Amino acid sequence: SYAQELKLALHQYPNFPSEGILFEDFLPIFRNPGLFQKLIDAFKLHLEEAFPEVKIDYIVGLESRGFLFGPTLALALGVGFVPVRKAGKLPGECFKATYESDLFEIQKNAIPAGSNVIIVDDIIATGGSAAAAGELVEQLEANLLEYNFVMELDFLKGRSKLNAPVFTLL
Amino acid sequence: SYAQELKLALHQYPNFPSEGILFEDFLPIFRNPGLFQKLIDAFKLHLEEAFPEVKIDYIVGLESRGFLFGPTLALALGVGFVPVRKAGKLPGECFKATYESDLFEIQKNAIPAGSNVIIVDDIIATGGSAAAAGELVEQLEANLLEYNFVMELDFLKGRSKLNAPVFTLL
């Protein structure tokens, strides 16, 4: 239901990133508060159904598109939000992880060991950046309950680079 | 009141960006939903007091820290959110603006002419990136009611590079 209305709001751009790469732009969703609320409601409903008796401590969002809906979802759930950023952006002591090359970081003091988290991002394509975020979560000695994405490019089979379960809305 | 509790949650990092540059990290605010809600409430209260009879059409947030609270504030206000991104990130036709060098873009079809908007970001330092966002808003033929920031580094006098009024929470 919501997923369908959200799918319709997406705009496709052929060869945008680069030749061959078809891009799925979810930005129009945020331009409309009604559509944005539906996106948040859809993820919240999924997490309540998937983890009925497991408390989620933090939503961990990937820079920068994961930042567009991650914090809002965290607030809707009454939980904290922590970002995974491109290296060099976060101040203080950080754990690092590499996607063979792109480097990512997370602040060491952001999440206590034993915390249960959900990693979110807009699109899972190759899955490389999400995989790196998983490693960062592992270093914090936290538990990765699931990855939640808005869209998934099946032909790239990015889900195969990820250990924890994956849920994709559209 | 809220501002005080928010100020206390900030973490300072000397010479982080680079030598001399003192960094103000607001990320701890997002780790606590109660603090995050207060940040959103504070901006909402400000905008309701400053623009009681002027409808805000969009919150325009700067990449990437402006993405952390901008969308959530937009939803709290019942308005749309549109991002200003580092060049090369947005798909489709974009307006461009340069901060003499860093280039920024905004999608041409994101905001209708005549719209009233608020530009938001976490920190205003030199004001260069915010100034560029202002130019993008001008090209969309939209009205810039105000810039809203979480923090301001007064010694850099970034506010002097900005035309529209500025409100800084802390």
Side-chain angles (χ1 to χ4, degrees), chain A residues 1-18 20 22-170, chain B residues 1-18 20 22-170:
Chain A
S1 52
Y2 283 179
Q4 301 198 310
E5 200 170 358
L6 295 172
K7 295 176 174 180
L8 288 171
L10 306 178
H11 286 171
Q12 284 183 65
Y13 294 89
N15 316 298
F16 167 57
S18 52
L22 175 59
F23 191 69
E24 211 74 50
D25 177 20
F26 76 159
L27 293 175
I29 287 171
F30 302 89
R31 300 177 192 166
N32 186 308
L35 286 177
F36 187 11
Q37 188 62 247
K38 283 171 184 171
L39 177 92
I40 298 299
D41 288 352
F43 277 122
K44 179 163 175 292
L45 180 57
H46 166 256
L47 294 169
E48 291 172 334
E49 306 190 317
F51 303 104
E53 310 209 308
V54 177
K55 178 172 167 56
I56 290 170
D57 293 296
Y58 302 88
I59 289 301
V60 171
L62 312 194
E63 177 169 9
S64 351
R65 292 188 197 115
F67 292 2
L68 295 165
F69 71 98
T72 305
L73 173 60
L75 195 57
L77 294 165
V79 307
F81 176 85
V82 168
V84 164
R85 297 210 63 179
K86 322 291 182 63
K89 295 294 174 62
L90 294 163
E93 295 292 81
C94 299
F95 279 127
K96 312 175 179 186
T98 310
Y99 168 21
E100 294 302 318
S101 168
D102 279 350
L103 183 64
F104 298 82
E105 296 182 298
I106 198 162
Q107 297 172 308
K108 293 189 177 183
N109 76 310
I111 296 175
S115 294
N116 292 328
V117 316
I118 298 291
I119 284 168
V120 306
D121 200 6
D122 74 326
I123 304 164
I124 176 178
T126 76
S129 55
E135 288 174 34
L136 290 167
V137 168
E138 214 177 324
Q139 293 182 64
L140 283 165
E141 292 184 288
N143 302 305
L144 180 54
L145 304 178
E146 223 183 28
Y147 285 95
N148 282 193
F149 302 101
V150 172
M151 308 156 257
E152 167 171 40
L153 309 184
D154 291 4
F155 80 93
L156 289 176
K157 292 182 295 183
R159 187 179 299 220
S160 73
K161 303 188 178 183
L162 316 185
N163 273 60
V166 171
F167 167 75
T168 55
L169 190 64
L170 315 172
Chain B
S1 52
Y2 283 179
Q4 301 198 310
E5 200 170 358
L6 295 172
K7 295 176 174 180
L8 288 171
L10 306 178
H11 286 171
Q12 284 183 65
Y13 294 89
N15 316 298
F16 167 57
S18 52
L22 175 59
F23 191 69
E24 211 74 50
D25 177 20
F26 76 159
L27 293 175
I29 287 171
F30 302 89
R31 300 177 192 166
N32 186 308
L35 286 177
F36 187 11
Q37 188 62 247
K38 283 171 184 171
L39 177 92
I40 298 299
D41 288 352
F43 277 122
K44 179 163 175 292
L45 180 57
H46 166 256
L47 294 169
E48 291 172 334
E49 306 190 317
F51 303 104
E53 310 209 308
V54 177
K55 178 172 167 56
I56 290 170
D57 293 296
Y58 302 88
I59 289 301
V60 171
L62 312 194
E63 177 169 9
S64 351
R65 292 188 197 115
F67 292 2
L68 295 165
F69 71 98
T72 305
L73 173 60
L75 195 57
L77 294 165
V79 307
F81 176 85
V82 168
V84 164
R85 297 210 63 179
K86 322 291 182 63
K89 295 294 174 62
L90 294 163
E93 295 292 81
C94 299
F95 279 127
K96 312 175 179 186
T98 310
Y99 168 21
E100 294 302 318
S101 168
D102 279 350
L103 183 64
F104 298 82
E105 296 182 298
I106 198 162
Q107 297 172 308
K108 293 189 177 183
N109 76 310
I111 296 175
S115 294
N116 292 328
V117 316
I118 298 291
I119 284 168
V120 306
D121 200 6
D122 74 326
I123 304 164
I124 176 178
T126 76
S129 55
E135 288 174 34
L136 290 167
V137 168
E138 214 177 324
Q139 293 182 64
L140 283 165
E141 292 184 288
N143 302 305
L144 180 54
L145 304 178
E146 223 183 28
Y147 285 95
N148 282 193
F149 302 101
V150 172
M151 308 156 257
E152 167 171 40
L153 309 184
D154 291 4
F155 80 93
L156 289 176
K157 292 182 295 183
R159 187 179 299 220
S160 73
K161 303 188 178 183
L162 316 185
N163 273 60
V166 171
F167 167 75
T168 55
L169 190 64
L170 315 172

